[PDB]
Design a protein around this ligand. Structure first.
Ligand SMILES: [Ca+2]
Length: 223
């Protein structure tokens, strides 16, 4: 997260870290046994880490749970990042408490202008590299369709939305991929892609979660 703030310990209790020897992506806990992330974050041998603030220090509220299976959306296109969504099932159920909690799926898509909360452990610089140890947060609005499509001509599908600031300086970045975009207390987006980070006229592009609720509910009810 570029140009954001320190969230504060366990004030984002649905945020997970995906670890394969090292943190590589975020995710969102949607119930005791399931995590939503980005399909582009797929790899085998994922450990999910819940209740994290400093990802480099055990502070005592963490739960480290292996993934039993991963289900990439059947229409995910890694060239276009269309349908950049994946479900990860935990080998055992998380203990839900004040520091580890699930986020609701949306019943409705969110409106342009809505301020959303985006979080993660990704890069904090738009030029150069500096990764944080503690969870960073950003408030950003959902941009209109027309300004999204103008920023990324011929690249935005109906399964994508833009959020952030056209002036630049504030954005998600790599290492944030897979993490949550929460608007009015519902998971509305997944950190997916963008051209650089926090660049002028190049806002973040997010997977539009409200398009996938049936698929999520179907898949979880059968796996
Ligand atoms: Ca920790």
């Amino acid at each position: 997260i570029v140009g954001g703030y320190t969230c504060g310990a366990n004030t984002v209790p649905y945020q997970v870290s995906l670890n394969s020897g090292y943190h590589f992506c975020g995710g969102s806990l949607i119930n005791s046994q399931w995590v939503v992330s980005a399909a582009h974050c797929y790899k085998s041998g994922i450990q999910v880490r819940l209740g994290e603030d400093n990802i480099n220090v055990v502070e005592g509220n963490e739960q480290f749970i292996s993934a039993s299976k991963s289900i990439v959306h059947p229409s995910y296109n890694s060239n276009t990042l269309n349908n950049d969504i994946m479900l990860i099932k935990l080998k055992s159920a998380a203990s839900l408490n004040s520091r580890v909690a699930s986020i609701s799926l949306p019943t409705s898509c969110a409106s342009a202008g809505t301020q959303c909360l985006i979080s993660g452990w990704g890069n904090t610089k738009s030029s150069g590299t500096s990764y944080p140890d503690v969870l960073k947060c950003l408030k950003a609005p959902i941009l209109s369709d027309s300004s999204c499509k103008s920023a990324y001509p011929g690249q935005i599908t109906s399964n994508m939305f833009c959020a952030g600031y056209l002036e630049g300086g504030k954005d998600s970045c790599q290492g944030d991929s897979g993490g949550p975009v929460v608007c009015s207390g519902k998971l509305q987006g997944i950190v997916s892609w963008g051209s650089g980070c926090a660049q002028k006229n190049k806002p973040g592009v997010y997977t539009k979660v409200c398009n996938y609720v049936s698929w999520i509910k179907q898949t979880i009810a059968s796996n």
